[PDB]
Write a protein that binds this ligand. Structure first.
Ligand SMILES: *CCC(=O)N1CC[C@H](n2cc(-c3ccncc3)c(-c3cccc(OCc4ccc5c(c4)CN(C)C5=O)c3)n2)C1
Length: 279
């Protein structure tokens, strides 16, 4: 809980179902420096009880660090709450894959799959369920390092095309329904940011899933990769993969990436890679 007077919103970065994200500046009290931060200002007013719930839930998730999960760094208790996290200059992975649609290699796509599975497995080990995993909620720290944002905002504050059937029908959320959203997240990556079930209304999604219909195989995917996605969308939650199995599977694929993804010109920066690490 920090003083609102210390944070200044300077530029809009985007928005989600709960708020507007800004690139902000932190000016510590007594100081003249401006430290860049990311601020999400919630659209709806919230009760002090709901603010305490956000802080408590963030305190438990952030008790231990995980390199692939964003932690809530601070909060400003204004008219509407302002959540503060580390600024990710590269924005979200959904926008990143759309921008680099002609320059993304199989090695990067497969590593991002491992990283998201590692961040999701960390939440599962802590018995925490995200409820809103999507490529828009995976942020890019560097092209080699992605992190999941917005943990717990869904439960505390509806993305039908990312939800497991049991979640659509009964608002049931488990680690296995997060696995279903992981499959959809992978499908967005593998199609370079396509919209799932494009042209199908959200009201028809449950029935479409009930008939056996699923997202199609992205052109770059071998059957081995698509089969893992399909298993994430099994009606029976217990038949879907576990995040630790997904980690193993995608990590195996990442060690020989051209055997699992076929991308045009895949075979074609070392200094930038080194500098990203050093910085
Ligand atoms: C590309 C899609 C897009 O535009 N988005 C807007 C919504 C979502 N997003 C992006 C960012 C962001 C952008 C740049 N740098 C950093 C972050 C955020 C964001 C911004 C500020 C604060 C945020 O807090 C998320 C958070 C993290 C942990 C926890 C909670 C909330 C609540 N809780 C209990 C936690 O443990 C997120 N949002 C993509």
């Amino acid at each position: 809980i920090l003083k609102e007077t210390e944070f200044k919103k300077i530029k809009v970065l985007g928005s989600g179902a709960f708020g507007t994200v800004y690139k902000g500046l932190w000016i510590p009290e007594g100081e003249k420096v401006k430290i860049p931060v990311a601020i999400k200002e919630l659209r709806e007013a919230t009760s002090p009880k709901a603010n305490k719930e956000i802080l408590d839930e963030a305190y438990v998730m952030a008790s231990v660090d995980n390199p692939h999960v964003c932690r809530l760094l601070g909060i400003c208790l204004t008219s509407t709450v302002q959540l503060i996290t580390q600024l990710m200059p590269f924005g979200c992975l959904l926008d990143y894959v759309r921008e680099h649609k002609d320059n993304i290699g199989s090695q990067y796509l497969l590593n991002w799959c491992v990283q998201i599975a590692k961040g999701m497995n960390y939440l599962e080990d802590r018995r925490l369920v995200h409820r809103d995993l999507a490529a828009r909620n995976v942020l890019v720290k560097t092209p080699q390092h992605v992190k999941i944002t917005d943990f717990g905002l869904a439960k505390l504050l509806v993305p039908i095309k990312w939800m497991a059937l049991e979640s659509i029908l009964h608002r049931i959320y488990t680690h296995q329904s997060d696995v279903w959203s992981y499959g959809v997240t992978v499908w967005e990556l593998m199609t370079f940011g396509s919209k799932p079930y494009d042209g199908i209304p959200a009201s028809e999604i449950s029935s479409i899933l009930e008939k056996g219909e699923r997202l199609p195989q992205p052109p770059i995917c071998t059957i081995d990769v698509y089969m893992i996605m399909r298993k994430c969308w099994m009606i029976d939650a217990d038949s879907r993969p576990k995040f630790r199995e997904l980690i193993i599977e995608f990590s195996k694929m990442a060690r020989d990436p051209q055997r699992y993804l076929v991308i045009q010109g895949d075979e074609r920066s070392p200094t930038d890679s080194n500098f990203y690490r050093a910085l």
